[PDB]
């Protein structure tokens, strides 16, 4: 079978890509986003346990087996997952396929499919092997749609712009072709017969034709720019809205840059949707007309031009892949160099203390030299391609002139027809060249379309819920925990069996340990994460059966890492209010003992906030303004008697000792503390 | 008399830029980086106190005033500096030059010279008016130096690669000019008289000429690339090596991005040192020769081509400023949108908790539209430029063909000469086109060369160091502070008149809250910063009169903020020693009990670690063998005083030695 190699879309999904490659090899194709959701791919990477769990989900009978140096040459399962370590970095997942007297070309998701013969593979390969095997639950099918077809549906609303652009292109091509025959009339009738009167008329006519052509080009450019802008904005807003509607498992398993980088993928899709389609459907007809006209002028010169364009296309197609490979390596070296630079600049104190200026300088010099070597390789590939294209084009032009002169001498073609053919060459070479130049655009934009749209297939938070309602009054009753466990992805469990009961009151567990996970079950109570093997009861009959529009509405939270958004304090303190006046905000600040701080600012309640400047009190005011029934506090009045307060801290202080205190430490609560 | 406007090189040079503009107005030009250290510019910007202090140091008599909204109708001073709130989110410093009815001239470092209506100006002016007057001792003079010459001095080592490029370009131009007469020979001497054999001979000769031309183009393009890489590497290495020697004020007075981004300016400097100089040398002679040949062919066609290229030059150098302004506005809007996206993604928990998904979606939608507006602005400018250039080029070509045919009808000139002129037109229009297009490269690289030269002209740490003495004896005994007060720039003082003894070989500790600033004392001990007034004494021979190497080799300091460098743990633990190793660290592993922690990674290798951990820093300081050692929260050693441990909370260490409180309240 074909050695399918799925390539990474981000920097930390090697295991997901390898699992997708195995599934595709065995005949099962799925979105990579869903695959990495199944593997629990955190922002730090993926563990083998996640791959084992996800493979069994798809029906594979996975198994983690340790292997030794001589265990590579064994009659085990031919397609397998191997753990490798790249030069002076962390681990990495690759695929071994056949191992035929050499380590077969491994489907390395990072860089294409590299060979890695059996001379240095075992030097970078530990005994980490996964022995996948199809099972009963395996069901071959294609569970991902062609997402380029899903896009281009934004052309349908403004479909009158595409037609106008097509008509403008046709008129532009016709006018240019009509004006290309200036020299033929110039060098056959207007000069050979000395027609001074007709010369001015024909020149003015061709000038008017060219002016109309320029106006058509102007209009077409305006329309193309507007179409591209509209498609960009539509794709960007759709992706952003769907991301904002996504659950928290998606958000905490990716970096901010990783999520935001899909915004730059909305321009590549726009390119493939507008520019590629326009170029294809315009330049196809343009090239057909140009070829017909060239064959009308002279068959031999048309054949020569066809050979020229075939040679240019062959050269470009051959040089496409090495250019991409060289441009990938320069990015890695540049990233390494800038990482070294930033880590050296940030840690200037340590370098100065130990007098290591020269060592860091030498390391940076080595990094810069490697970057320059990669850049020179890329430049040399560009130079070779440009030289080959130049020799092809120049020899083609010279041979065209030579054969045209020979034909004119033989009497088979007019003198001005040679220059007419030369001028018409621009309408048969440029279209085919533009059509050939669509391979990088199409490939990169297909990759970008998959990358951007695999998120859009993810289920959001709203539709992941079960039935709801039957409890409309805001929850205020007793809180119960039923032996709930939480994994926080696919890592080691940190929420071993917990059972507790909070009967309203005002004070609950303050400290369990200095880093035991007191915030994580607070978020779990707020229904950010769904507990596994257990239920959360606030006597609202399995809160997972309550709408998020109320759960998030009547539960507060204030912690150390309070995030303040850039904006006026009036909006920030009352985010998402749409029913709150200035008096309510002032009162909420008053019971939060923060009105003095607000008045301390120059513009007071209209002061812009620069995300920095006490900021902790602001979240207290926001939570109090939310008017919740459960008000969770981390380390840091105006509240009703029947309002639950959590007051979680990190110091064994027992500030108030008002009510029962819990603590979890490592496992169960196993502490009454009442 | 000219309204001087100084562009700001970074995102926080507003006060420095306006003060430099004022200094240049009165005839005193100084390097900007030498100004945003007397102003005390920090990561958060400069205050009015910094501007006043720097003006006083420059000789300017400076004063501050909270001007009202009715006193602007007078003559305070002409070049006065004002504080304005740009948009409604950030503060900024501008220069108000002339006060006129409903029009005010404002030099804003971000934008340029702008005109604001008086009532329109009143909507953003939140009481600035720093008043500056020429002092009794204000000596004018140009204190900066040309930097393009300084970076062109990097070409002297390579005087046999530029010459080879020049010769290759000259012979390439000659071959192309010779080969452009193929069409003239074809349509004037061979087709007309039907010479078949001469056709083949001449075609083969011109094919050989073109092949030689391309071969000379392949060998010349490699040398240009090599020259560019050499110049870039030299500039980057020199800049980085000089930066790694600057004092600690430079590193904490600037963001990391403001230091890293100076690497990208080396590319611009190389582009206008190698590319611009080579183009100026080559294309000038190439255009002169091409114009000479065009005039030899026909005078009227040469005049028409000159008119065409002049119109193209005017059109190119009239759309110059609008394109730059549009690109700058697009960059600003893209930066704002990216910052909003980062804030929205990072604070997802607050948005989801408070149900602000639809509000933030609408807010981000209104920010993408603002980017699209400026993108369409640059698109309109580019399309107008392209349409005008295409009109000029096409109409000029048509007029050239028309006039050439008209001449061919007359006795002068011939059709073959017309085709030869059409071929030669590419060797006179392209050189002037390149010489006109060189302007943005020259401007951008002048800015870049200024940016790098400002840092490269800064005196290093060793340069400001005082003369050493014969105190090679290791620092040990009675660390004395005498009325020491410290400032972190021009901000509020952190230290004020602290005196303490630090008895030799004791367990002395200092206790205080977060705002006390004990790490400030620790950094002042290591000569990272110098005390504003006073000195530090260690049993005589005050700390300001001894070498820096002894300072850095004996005052090893470890705190909570541990930084692990990406590399070998052996090199990380023994950092900067470059001497005997691989054994002593083992004892340092045993002494600090770090051997157990590091003997668990299942590779026994460099342990890159991809950048708790205080133990590794502790073992790092053990190799230094320090006579003075400081801890924050993390022993043994010997009789020398190796514990100046910091203490934040009470009772963390109750009975070790004498305890110092904040501001040295009690011992």
């Amino acid at each position: 079978k074909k050695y399918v190699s799925v390539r990474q879309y981000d920097l930390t999904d090697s295991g997901a890509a390898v699992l997708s490659s195995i599934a595709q090899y065995y005949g099962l194709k799925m979105s990579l986003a869903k695959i990495r959701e199944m593997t629990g791919t955190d922002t730090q990477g993926t563990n083998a346990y996640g791959l084992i769990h996800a493979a069994k989900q798809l029906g594979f009978s996975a198994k983690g087996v340790k292997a030794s140096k001589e265990d590579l040459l064994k009659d085990f399962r031919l397609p397998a997952i191997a753990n490798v370590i790249v030069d002076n970095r962390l681990a990495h997942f690759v695929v071994i396929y056949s191992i035929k007297n050499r380590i077969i070309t491994v489907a390395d998701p990072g860089k294409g499919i590299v060979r890695y013969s059996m001379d240095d593979f075992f030097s970078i390969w530990t005994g980490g092997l996964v022995l996948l095997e199809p099972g009963e639950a395996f069901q071959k099918g294609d569970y991902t749609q062609n997402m380029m077809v899903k896009f281009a549906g934004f052309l349908k609303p403004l479909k009158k712009t595409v037609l106008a652009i097509f008509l403008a292109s046709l008129l532009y091509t016709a006018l240019g072709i009509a004006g290309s025959f200036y020299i033929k009339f110039l060098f056959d009738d207007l000069i050979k017969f000395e027609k001074l009167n007709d010369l001015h008329i024909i020149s003015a006519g061709f000038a008017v034709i060219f002016l109309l052509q320029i106006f058509l080009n102007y209009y077409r450019s305006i329309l193309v720019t507007k179409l591209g802008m509209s498609i960009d904005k539509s794709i960007m807003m759709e992706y952003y809205s769907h991301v904002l509607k996504l659950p928290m498992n998606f958000f905490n398993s990716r970096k901010v840059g990783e999520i935001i980088s899909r915004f730059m993928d909305a321009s590549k899709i726009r390119q493939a949707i507008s520019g590629a389609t326009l170029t294809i459907m315009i330049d196809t007809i343009m090239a057909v007309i140009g070829g017909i006209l060239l064959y009308i002028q002279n068959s031999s010169l048309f054949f020569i031009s066809f050979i020229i364009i075939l040679l240019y296309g062959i050269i470009v197609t051959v040089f496409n892949k090495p250019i991409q490979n060289a441009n990938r390596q320069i990015m890695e070296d540049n990233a390494k160099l800038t990482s070294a630079l930033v880590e050296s600049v940030k840690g200037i104190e340590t370098i100065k203390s130990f007098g290591a200026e020269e060592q860091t300088e030498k390391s940076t010099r080595d990094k810069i030299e490697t970057v320059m070597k990669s850049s020179f390789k890329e430049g040399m590939l560009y130079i070779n391609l440009s030289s080959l294209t130049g020799i092809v084009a120049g020899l083609g032009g010279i041979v065209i002139l030579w054969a045209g002169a020979y034909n004119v001498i033989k009497g088979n073609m007019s003198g001005g027809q040679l220059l007419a053919f030369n001028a018409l060459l621009a309408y048969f070479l440029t279209p085919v060249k533009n059509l050939i130049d669509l391979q990088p655009l199409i490939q990169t934009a297909v990759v970008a379309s998959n990358r951007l749209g695999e998120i859009l297939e993810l289920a959001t938070e709203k539709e992941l819920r079960e039935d709801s309602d039957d409890f409309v009054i805001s929850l205020k009753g007793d809180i119960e925990f039923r032996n709930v466990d939480f994994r926080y992805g696919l890592r080691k469990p940190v929420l071993k069996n917990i059972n507790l009961t909070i009967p309203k009151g005002k004070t609950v567990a303050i400290v369990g340990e200095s880093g035991s996970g007191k915030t994580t079950l607070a978020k779990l109570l707020m229904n950010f994460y769904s507990p596994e093997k257990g239920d959360i009861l606030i006597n609202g009959h399995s809160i997972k059966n309550i709408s998020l529009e109320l759960i998030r509405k009547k539960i507060a939270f204030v912690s150390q890492d309070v995030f303040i958004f850039s904006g006026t304090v009036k909006e920030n303190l009352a985010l998402g209010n749409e029913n709150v006046d200035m008096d309510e905000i002032i009162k909420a600040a008053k019971m939060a003992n923060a009105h003095d701080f607000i008045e301390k600012l120059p513009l007071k309640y209209d002061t812009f906030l620069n995300e920095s400047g006490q900021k902790q009190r602001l979240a207290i005011a926001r939570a109090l303004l939310k008017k919740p029934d459960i008000l969770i506090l981390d380390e840091a009045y105006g509240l009703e008697d029947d309002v639950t307060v959590i007051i979680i801290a990190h110091r064994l202080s027992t500030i108030v000792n008002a009510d029962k205190i819990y603590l979890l430490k490592d496992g169960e609560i196993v502490e009454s503390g009442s | 008399k000219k309204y001087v406007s100084v562009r700001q090189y970074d995102l926080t040079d507003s006060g420095a830029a306006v003060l430099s503009s004022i200094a240049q107005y009165y005839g005193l030009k100084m390097s900007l980086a030498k100004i945003r250290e007397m102003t005390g510019t920090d990561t958060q910007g400069t205050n009015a106190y910094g501007l006043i202090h720097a003006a006083k140091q420059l000789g300017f008599s400076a004063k501050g005033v909270k001007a009202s909204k009715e006193d602007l109708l007078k003559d305070f001073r002409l070049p006065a500096i004002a504080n304005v709130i740009v948009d409604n989110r950030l503060a900024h410093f501008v220069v108000i030059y002339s006060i006129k009815n409903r029009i005010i001239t404002v030099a804003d470092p971000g934008k340029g010279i702008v005109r604001y209506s008086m009532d329109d100006f009143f909507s953003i002016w939140t009481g600035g008016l720093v008043l500056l007057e020429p002092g009794e001792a204000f000596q004018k003079g140009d204190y900066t130096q040309n930097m393009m010459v300084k970076f062109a001095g990097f070409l002297k080592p390579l005087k046999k690669t530029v010459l080879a490029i020049f010769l290759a370009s000259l012979l390439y131009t000659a071959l192309g000019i010779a080969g452009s007469f193929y069409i003239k020979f074809l349509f004037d001497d061979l087709i007309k008289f039907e010479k078949l054999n001469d056709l083949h001979i001449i075609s083969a000769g011109f094919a050989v000429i073109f092949l030689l031309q391309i071969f000379l183009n392949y060998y010349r393009s490699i040398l240009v690339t090599k020259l560019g890489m050499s110049i870039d590497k030299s500039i980057m290495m020199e800049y980085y090596s000089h930066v790694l020697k600057l004092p600690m004020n430079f590193f904490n007075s600037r963001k990391v991005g403001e230091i890293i981004s100076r690497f990208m300016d080396a590319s611009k400097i190389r582009q206008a040192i190698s590319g611009a100089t080579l183009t100026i040398m080559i294309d000038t002679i190439m255009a002169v020769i091409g114009g000479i040949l065009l005039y030899i062919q026909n005078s009227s066609l040469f005049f028409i081509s000159f008119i065409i290229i002049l119109l193209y030059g005017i059109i190119v150098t009239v759309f110059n400023k609008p394109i730059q302004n549009a690109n700058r506005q697009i960059m600003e809007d893209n930066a704002k949108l990216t910052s909003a996206l980062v804030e929205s993604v990072k604070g997802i928990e607050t948005i989801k908790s408070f149900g602000a998904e639809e509000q933030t979606e609408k807010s981000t939608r209104d920010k993408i539209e603002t980017v699209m507006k400026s993108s369409f602005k640059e698109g309109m400018l580019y399309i107008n430029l392209s349409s005008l250039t295409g009109i000029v080029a096409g109409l000029g070509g048509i007029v050239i063909l028309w006039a050439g045919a008209y001449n061919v009808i007359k006795g002068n000139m011939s059709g073959g000469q017309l085709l030869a002129f059409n071929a030669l037109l590419a060797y006179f229009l392209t050189p002037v086109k390149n010489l006109i297009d060189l302007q943005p490269l020259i401007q951008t690289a002048v800015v870049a060369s200024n940016r790098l030269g400002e840092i490269l002209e800064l005196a290093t740490e060793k340069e400001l160091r005082e003369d050493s003495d014969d105190f090679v004896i290791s620092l040990k005994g009675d660390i004395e502070f005498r009325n020491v007060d410290f400032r972190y720039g021009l901000r509020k003082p952190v230290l004020k008149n602290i005196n303490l003894t630090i008895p030799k070989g004791k367990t002395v500790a200092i206790v205080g809250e977060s705002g006390s600033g004990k790490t400030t004392l620790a950094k002042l001990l290591m000569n990272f910063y110098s005390p504003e007034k006073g000195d530090i004494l260690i049993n005589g021979h005050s700390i300001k009169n001894i070498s820096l190497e002894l300072i850095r080799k004996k005052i090893a300091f470890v705190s909570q903020d541990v930084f692990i460098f990406s590399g070998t743990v052996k090199e990380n633990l023994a950092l900067g020693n470059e001497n005997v190793d691989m054994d002593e660290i083992i004892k340092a592993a045993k002494m600090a009990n770090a051997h157990d922690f590091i003997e668990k990674l299942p590779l026994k290798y460099d342990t890159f670690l991809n950048e708790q951990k205080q133990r590794l820093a502790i073992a790092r300081a053990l190799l230094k063998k320090p006579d003075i050692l400081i801890l924050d929260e993390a022993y043994g050693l010997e009789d020398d005083v190796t514990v100046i441990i910091i203490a934040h909370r009470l009772s963390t260490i109750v009975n070790a030695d004498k305890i110092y409180l904040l501001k040295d309240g009690e011992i």
């Binding site: 990474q8 920097l11 930390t12 999904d13 090697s14 295991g15 730090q44 990477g45 993926t46 563990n47 083998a48 346990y49 791959l51 084992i52 198994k63 983690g64 087996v65 340790k66 292997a67 265990d71 753990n83 970095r89 962390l90 681990a91 990495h92 997942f93 980490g128 890592r491 080691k492 | 299942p602 991809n610």
Partner: peptide, 16 residues
């Protein structure tokens, strides 16, 4: 030829 323990199996880190 031996299955990795649960503690060790999760120690098998992947990308980055």
């Amino acid at each position: 030829g031996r299955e990795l323990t649960d503690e060790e199996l999760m120690e098998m880190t992947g990308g980055s």
